[PDB]
């Protein structure tokens, strides 16, 4: 149940 | 094979690319871009007012379908 | 035991049980997890909190060196 996400920035 | 970016706005209209979308014809687009590659990087950007319960919709269409490789993207 | 910070709908924001700030949340995490990057951190928020504040959440656990996210609703 968690969806694992990551950050992406400039 | 363009990069994948959905934009979510602040009157909650989606978008891929500059193809507009709803979650119900969201994974149908998807996979029409990525010829059903599931590997595929999806980078999400929203609006800054756009609001968790709004964001957790989209990521669970994704999820649901097997797009499990997400990026959230920040100014 | 996972880690799960929270975002409330008035912007206060939890490690576990216990409140932190943006400017105090990494010291906070830090002492819970031995350092240890790899740990995952489980993001809950209220339905209404915004993606700016998500955000700035996520470029704060990022630039430590948290990268593994995983979004609870």
Request: hydrophobic share 40%.
């Given at each position: 149940?968690?969806?694992?996400?990551?950050?992406?920035?400039? | 094979?363009?990069?994948?970016?959905?934009?979510?706005?602040?009157?909650?209209?989606?978008?891929?690319?500059?193809?507009?979308?709803?979650?119900?014809?969201?994974?149908?687009?998807?996979?029409?871009?990525?010829?059903?590659?599931?590997?595929?990087?999806?980078?999400?950007?929203?609006?800054?007012?756009?609001?968790?319960?709004?964001?957790?919709?989209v990521?669970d269409?994704?999820?649901?379908?097997?797009?499990?490789?997400?990026?959230?993207?920040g100014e």
């Amino acid at each position: 149940q968690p969806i694992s996400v990551t950050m992406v920035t400039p | 094979e363009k990069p994948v970016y959905l934009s979510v706005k602040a009157d909650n209209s989606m978008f891929i690319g500059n193809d507009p979308v709803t979650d119900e014809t969201m994974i149908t687009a998807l996979n029409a871009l990525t010829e059903g590659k599931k590997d595929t990087t999806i980078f999400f950007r929203a609006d800054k007012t756009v609001d968790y319960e709004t964001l957790m919709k989209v990521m669970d269409t994704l999820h649901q379908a097997g797009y499990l490789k997400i990026g959230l993207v920040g100014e």
